């Protein structure tokens, strides 16, 4: 299932996170800092995902935002990419565009849209 979902910028700023695993905040920060570095450093799109520990980090850049959904190695990364795209479409419908500015200043609505679209991971 989905373990967590991250939205972050090219400067490495985590703008949204949704976790389906309970971890202390410092543990989550260690994870997200590492993951953001890994994904930002990928210069060639040779896969939809990066293998990381026991997870597949399925990710895609939309405008200047990276959307990453961490799933199990055996999980369906194709369906996960579709899920990410459908979330982005929901954001684009509400905000009229896909912008970091919206995630900064309307965090709760972006989170609400995600949370109500994704059920339990």
């Amino acid at each position: 299932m989905i373990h967590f979902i991250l939205l972050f910028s090219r400067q490495g700023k985590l703008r949204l996170q949704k976790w389906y695993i309970t971890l202390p905040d410092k543990e989550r920060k260690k994870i997200t800092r590492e993951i953001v570095q890994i994904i930002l450093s990928r210069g060639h799109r040779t896969s939809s995902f990066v293998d990381w520990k026991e997870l597949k980090l399925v990710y895609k850049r939309y405008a200047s935002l990276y959307f990453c959904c961490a799933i199990e190695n055996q999980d369906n990364e194709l369906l996960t990419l579709e899920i990410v795209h459908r979330y982005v479409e929901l954001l684009d419908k509400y905000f009229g565009n896909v912008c970091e500015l919206d995630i900064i200043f309307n965090f709760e609505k972006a989170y609400f849209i995600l949370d109500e679209f994704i059920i339990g991971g």
Partner: protein, 165 residues
Amino acid sequence: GVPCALVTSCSSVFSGDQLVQHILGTEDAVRFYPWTIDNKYYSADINLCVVPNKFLVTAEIAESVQAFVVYFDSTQKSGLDSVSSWLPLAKAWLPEVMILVCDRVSEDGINRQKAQEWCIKHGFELVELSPEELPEEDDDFPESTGVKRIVQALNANVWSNVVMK
């Protein structure tokens, strides 16, 4: 206190003042240029602070820095030496917006790989004012480039003096 976006250039061909006039055009001695950021969420009166050399950064400028935009010359392999010399100041200021700007990367100098490695290491984003390539026609959610991207990045920031709408 009015925040500053500190702008400088490590290139001898293109100055911070020139870059600031490009930013202002969108829809030695320090110089300040007033600029009102205005979007659907907030307005904020900031200064674009052009600082030609780092040794002119005073304590009072430093404490106002909330963004850092540094232009560099990509044509030589040594192009990031002068930029990295600003990093002690940048890690002191801890600006939320950090942008490395060039006209374009150079495969014979600072290529995209090397500029990206430096930006990711230091928390910057790389911007080219004149990218050689136009974006791919099937990049349906393309990234902005150039001064438009700089302005977008400066908008995507919670300035200390935001006036919320």
